[PDB]
Amino acid sequence: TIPHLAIDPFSLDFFDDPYPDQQTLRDAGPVVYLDKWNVYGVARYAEVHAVLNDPTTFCSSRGVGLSDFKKEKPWRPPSLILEADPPAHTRPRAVLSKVLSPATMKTIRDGFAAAADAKVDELLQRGCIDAIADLAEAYPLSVFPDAMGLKQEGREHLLPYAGLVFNAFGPPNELRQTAIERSAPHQAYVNEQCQRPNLAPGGFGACIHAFTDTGEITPDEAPLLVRSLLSAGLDTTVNGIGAAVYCLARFPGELQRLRSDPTLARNAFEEAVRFESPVQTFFRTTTREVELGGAVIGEGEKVLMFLGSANRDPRRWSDPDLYDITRKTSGHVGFGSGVHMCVGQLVARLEGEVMLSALARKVAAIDIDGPVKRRFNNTLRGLESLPVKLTPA
């Protein structure tokens, strides 16, 4: 009764244009079976939202990738928060919440916004730039590693390590095999910076290590919690900011509405997160036999959630293929939903807002003037190169 589909959502053809296949996944039924990897799939908004908010049945401690930790060894020690279930997930999550707290954003917002204005001012002096390397990558690299309290040496390992982690969530294809095949130097750097003496005072890293005496985490848990921020804190904001610029480059009408009201910068970034969904997919594992969308799913089965497809489901969104900076984006699953919803979404929204704010006040037009190249990742959707000409306001 469950439709079987041969679509490979982790193929280069799928990444190149996933929207026709995503509607096919949605319309085939509420629950599908992907014969390519022997997993269940949910593509409509309702089932994606239901699975995310049922952590007891659709657990994360057996891996949020394709690999089942009950069957295969994890390529790295499991994350204490992303790949953990309640109650073991509760207190590590609370520490990262207080480290990336609303009170923390007040201390870094001015420096984050000043670096965004300075970056746009610098890019306008060049004219024709690469919105990926010179903006989507250059800006987060100019604020986040310093906010983490990282030293200067070795920062070129951060993005390769992140692309490795998100490629590792995928199936054992060549993208995943090649990533782990080039991995030992990157984890050696990242794991070393997770140690307390290597994190500058005042940064997120030192703040995590200071939370070890409250009884919420132990000193031996702090390095892996810092590893979470070094795994997910940079590459997500790169593809999130690269998505917003790509949207404003393809939709000049929305760029003109943003210029007229720069206070829309926060929602313009949030709508970009829904439109592109830089975090495309995540898995869950059934801890029991469960009925979902008229389909019964056995225990220990992998269920693939299409977050990007749920953000474009016409059963939930009106004109889902339209970029609307004034759309009420509340409910989108670009940051997840439930107990695992993005704990660093305040940092991500701060970086996105101040960057779109700088563009809104300083840029009059963003025109693509070069060949667009896509970056292929088993989890992340984003561009490799985006040549644009920036016209000063």
Ligand X SMILES: CCOc1cccc(C(=O)O)c1
Say how far apart CA 40 and CA 338 lie, in whole Å: 21
186 binds Cl ion (CB under 5 A): no
The residue type at 272: A
Residues within window 275-294 making contact with ligand HEM, judged by CB under 6 A: 278-279, 282
User: Contact 382/238 with Cβ under 8 angstroms?
Assistant: yes
User: Contact 305/58 with Cβ under 8 angstroms?
Assistant: no
Among 76, 209, 312, 332, binds Cl ion (CB under 5 A): 76
Site string for ligand X, 151-190 (x = CB under 6 A): --------------x-------------------------
Among 24, 53, 104, 187, binds Cl ion (CB under 5 A): 187
Least distance CB 1 / ligand HEM (angstroms): 28
81 binds ligand X (CB under 6 A): yes
Among 44, 93, 119, 332, binds ligand HEM (CB under 6 A): 93
Rg, the chain, Cα only: 20
Helix, strand or coil, per DSSP, at residue 131: coil
Q: Are strands 373-376 and 295-297 parallel, antiparallel or unpaired?
A: unpaired
Residues within window 109-148 making contact with ligand HEM, judged by CB under 6 A: none
- Judged by beta carbon, residue 192 or residue 369, the one nearer ligand X is 192
173 binds Cl ion (CB under 5 A): no
Say how far apart CA 202 and CA 293 lie, in whole Å: 48
Q: Which stretch binds ligand HEM (CB under 6 A): 18-26, 208-216, 225-233, 373-381?
A: 225-233
Nearest to 96 by CA among 187, 199, 221, 198: 221
- Judged by beta carbon, residue 2 or residue 190, the one nearer ligand HEM is 190
Which is it for the CA torsion 320, 325, 326, 330, positive or negative? positive
Least distance CB 193 / Cl ion (angstroms): 11
81 binds ligand HEM (CB under 6 A): yes
231 binds ligand X (CB under 6 A): yes
236 binds ligand HEM (CB under 6 A): yes
Among 57, 67, 79, 280, binds ligand X (CB under 6 A): 79
Say how far apart CA 40 and CA 42 lie, in whole Å: 7
Q: Determine if residue 29 is left, alpha or beta; phi over 0 gives left, psi from -120 to 50 gives alpha, anything else beta.
A: left
Site string for ligand X, 310-349 (x = CB under 6 A): ----------------------------------------
340 C-beta neighbours (distance < 10 Å), count? 23
273 binds ligand X (CB under 6 A): no
Among 205, 233, 320, 382, binds ligand HEM (CB under 6 A): 233
Q: Is 342 annotated as a binding residue?
A: yes
**Number of shown-chain residues binding ligand HEM (CB under 6 A):** 28
- Judged by beta carbon, residue 162 or residue 355, the one nearer Cl ion is 162
Say how far apart CA 359 and CA 125 lie, in whole Å: 14
378 binds ligand HEM (CB under 6 A): no
Q: Which stretch binds ligand X (CB under 6 A): 20-28, 112-120, 223-231, 294-302?
A: 223-231
Say how far apart CA 134 and CA 144 lie, in whole Å: 16
Give the one entry of ligand X, ligand HEM, Cl ion, none that residue 343 binds, where binding means its C-beta sits below a cut-off of 5 to 8 angstroms depending on kind: ligand HEM
| φ, ψ (nearest 5 deg) of residue 126 | -90, -35
E strand map for the chain? 4-5, 32-34, 39-42, 58-59, 128-130, 281-286, 290-292, 295-297, 302-306, 363-368, 373-376, 381-385, 387-392
Query: Where are the alpha helices (H) located in 294-344, listed in sequence order?
Result: 307-310
**Contact residues for ligand X (CB under 6 A)?**
79, 81-82, 165, 227-228, 231-232, 236, 279
**Contact residues for Cl ion (CB under 5 A)?**
76, 187
Annotated binding site for heme b: 89, 93, 284, 340, 342
